[PDB]
Amino acid sequence: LREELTLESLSNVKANSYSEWITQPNVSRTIARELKSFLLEYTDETGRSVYGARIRTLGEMNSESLEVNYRHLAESKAILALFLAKCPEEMLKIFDLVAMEATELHYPDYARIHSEIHVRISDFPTIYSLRELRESNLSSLVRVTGVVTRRTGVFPQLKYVKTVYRNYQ
């Protein structure tokens, strides 16, 4: 509950699988603290903190998606990049909940503009065509290229199962 792990303590996965290690409360709190500490602190060579400059423009356009480069996340706190590649569906939930704290630090009451923010990953360093995908890739993050052959119309979809919706295509 109260005590937190060091970053070096996370070097050893202690449970029988990654997902069952990320989802533990002390591990999860440690990851949240470390991600927030990365987002408030990463710099260009010129100082000039890029993510403090991106959150600033998020509100200038009344937007909903924060964009994070993977190479920056791999350049320090490397283990978090590894966990992201292995368990994206958990890691992105924690990362989204950190991004809202960081944006509200610039713009208090931004929750009245949009209730929830999505982190977009960029520059993932390995690529497949639609040949190389196999069962080992299941639930892993992947990067793919091709031509868009067909597109449906846009529809609303029920978000939770009082009601809320989201767009779908």
Binding site: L1, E3, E8, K14
Partner: protein, 665 residues
């Protein structure tokens, strides 16, 4: 509450890190672990969590917590192995006490977590809930302990013993003697943990190896290899053999009985003696498979399943039946059998042992366990040196204990003693049957008078209180003693021992025993048969005899013999030789023919003798057909002399005084 539960789990987890950790300066990728502080208090409080809380509340929750945080695999083994390897290097060269303190206290937890599991109607609902899961985790423990550095933690446990071997018994304090009990108490558990037994609540009538475990991890074969490389067998051998010289016998010699039980269990002795070979016997077995295939083919139609016509069969009194299929057209035997087979009902049926680990008493032992060649020869060497070195000195001590302590016994110690006796006596008889280098003197402590009384007394007391499992084991032990006696008579005091073994009281008991066997499991009846064969054969070579044999011959014994004989598809070639020996005794010698004129015997001889059952060339058919020929000749004579026996053949014989005498003869 759930939160109090997880608070204790978290307390344990924090203790699972306060313990220490490896070194990230090291640049040695990876190093070993490195040591914490308060760690004495950490170990001690964990010990308290077991003893002062979980035992007092009867939970097994604490064990579930330590299994969650993987304490055994993660810390205890490297703490011990580092202590061992450090001290090993120091010995190669040829506060330190504090290191040794940590070595002791890590081992005591290893004994505690791997301790074997018992469930009763007095265990808590918590323990009953957790039984199936902690079984999985203990299986993981066995695999891990045998695996690390090819099992090197087992050298740490014996080095601890070697400190207390070291200096004279005259010096050795009670606290000191507990180490020598503790070390052996460890190996008992490591052998005893084995795959689970499935258990459910009988509310409604409707594998447990975890994903990380497999059979070759857990097999007894593995355990042999592991102990041999890590130098255990020398320790058990040296320790048992010099046992008579003033090691205080009291602290060692029951734990040291349990080891010998716990890995004699699940071996048939013939597997240790041979009596391209594998390929040759495989080819022969494929011939047997072809014969079974031929048997199916002989009941298979040539043309397809919808070609089939219809058949009608007319009885006397002009009544008709209908059966389908093309083979029924030609084979009346098949038509008659197929006619009855359609009918729905079967009479529902009745059913003896619980509370103890799998063994000869409640499993079919016609199923070996399997050895590497190196393992086969190493195991043969271990028990051969044990027998030539240790057996008499061990049995003499453990028996003259139990005579002074019989009243206080518990069911397991009884069933251990009776299945350690049995194994070693039989194996030696077989070994000297094979070869002249071996001799019978090595097992000769079994015969002296005190042990004979004790096996007798166990069998007596078990029979009176209707405890059927001890009665079963005692039957097995008492069988071997008699077998050993006939050996020694085929070479003084032994006749005295016989005369005392065959006082009238015991003949009443040993005559009584097959009669009750009719109800019970297939092994129980088999024990009764083999004991009976031996019991009569000794008294045949005593030269009384006519009194004793008439004591055996009556309806409820014959009932057992047939009830056992009809399950012949499952039994050995040898046991049927024993049954027909007895029928030869009843029918030809004693001339008590009237017992066997009963119909369910006549069915049996058709099944077994048909092209269905006993092979056309097994030795069994010689005996069976030679018996049935004589049977039917005497039956013919009886039926024509007195036609009332046609209605006799269905029913039991009739016990009236005035007609019954002429009936039986």
């Amino acid at each position: 509450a759930d939160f109090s539960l997880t608070v204790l789990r978290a307390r344990i987890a924090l203790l699972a890190t306060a313990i220490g950790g490896p070194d990230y300066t090291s640049q040695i990728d990876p190093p070993p672990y490195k040591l914490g502080d308060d760690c004495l208090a950490c170990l001690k409080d964990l010990k308290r969590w077991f003893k002062l809380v979980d035992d007092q509340q009867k939970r097994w929750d604490v064990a579930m917590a330590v299994a969650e945080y993987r304490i055994l695999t993660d810390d205890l083994l490297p703490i011990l192995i580092d202590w061992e390897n450090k001290c090993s290097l120091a010995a190669k060269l040829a506060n330190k006490a504090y290191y040794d303190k940590i070595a002791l206290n890590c081992l005591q937890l290893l004994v505690l977590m791997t301790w074997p599991l018992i469930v009763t109607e007095q265990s808590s609902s918590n323990q009953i809930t957790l039984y199936g899961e902690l079984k999985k985790h203990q299986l993981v423990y066995k695999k891990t302990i045998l695996s690390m550095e090819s099992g090197k933690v087992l050298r740490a446990a014996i080095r601890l013993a070697l400190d207390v071997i070291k200096i004279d018994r005259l010096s050795r304090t009670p606290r000191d003697n507990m180490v020598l009990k503790l070390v052996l108490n460890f190996f008992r558990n490591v052998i005893a943990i084995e795959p689970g037994e499935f258990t459910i609540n009988t509310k409604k009538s409707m594998d447990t190896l975890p994903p990380n475990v497999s059979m070759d991890d857990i097999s007894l074969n593995t355990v042999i290899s592991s102990f041999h490389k890590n130098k255990v067998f020398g320790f058990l051998l040296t320790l048992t053999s010099s046992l008579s010289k003033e090691f205080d016998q009291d602290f060692i010699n029951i734990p040291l009985l349990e080891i010998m039980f716990y890995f004699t269990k699940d071996v048939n002795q013939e597997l240790l003696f041979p009596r391209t070979s594998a390929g040759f016997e495989l080819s022969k077995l494929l011939q047997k498979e072809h014969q079974m295939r031929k048997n199916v083919i002989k009941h298979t139609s040539a043309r397809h399943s919808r070609f089939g016509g219809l058949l009608s069969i007319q009885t006397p009194d002009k009544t008709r039946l209908t059966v389908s299929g093309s083979q029924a057209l030609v084979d009346e035997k098949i038509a008659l059998q197929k006619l009855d087979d359609s009918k729905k009902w079967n009479k529902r049926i009745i059913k003896a042992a619980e509370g103890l680990p799998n063994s000869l008493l409640n499993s079919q032992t016609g199923k070996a366990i399997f050895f590497t060649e190196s393992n086969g020869k190493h195991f043969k060497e271990f028990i051969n040196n044990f027998i030539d070195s240790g057996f008499n000195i061990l049995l003499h001590s453990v028996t003259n204990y139990f005579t002074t302590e019989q009243d206080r016994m518990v069911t397991l110690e009884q069933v251990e003693y009776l299945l350690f006796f049995a194994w070693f006596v039989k194996y030696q008889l077989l070994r000297s049957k094979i070869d002249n280098s071996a001799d019978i003197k090595q097992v000769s402590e079994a015969l002296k008078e005190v042990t004979f009384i004790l096996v007798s007394s166990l069998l007596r007391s078990a029979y009176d209180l209707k405890n059927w499992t001890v009665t079963h084991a005692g039957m097995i032990a008492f069988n071997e003693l008699l077998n050993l006696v006939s050996r020694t008579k085929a070479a003084t005091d032994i006749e005295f021992i016989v005369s005392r073994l065959f006082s009238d009281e015991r003949i009443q008991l040993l005559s009584n025993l097959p009669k009750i066997g009719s109800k019970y499991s297939l092994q129980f009846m088999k024990s009764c048969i083999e004991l009976t064969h031996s019991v009569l054969k000794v008294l045949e070579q005593y030269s009384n005899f006519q009194k004793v044999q008439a004591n055996y011959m009556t309806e409820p014994v014959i009932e057992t013999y047939i009830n056992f004989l009809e399950r012949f598809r499952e039994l050995e070639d040898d046991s049927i030789k024993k049954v027909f020996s007895f029928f030869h005794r009843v029918f030809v010698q004693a001339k008590e023919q009237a017992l066997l004129f009963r119909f369910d015997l006549i069915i049996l001889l058709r099944e077994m003798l048909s092209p269905d059952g006993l092979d056309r060339m097994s030795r069994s058919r010689k005996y069976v057909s030679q018996f049935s020929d004589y049977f039917l000749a005497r039956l013919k004579k009886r039926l024509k002399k007195s036609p009332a026996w046609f209605v006799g053949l269905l029913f039991p014989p009739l016990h009236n005084s005035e007609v019954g005498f002429y009936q039986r003869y």
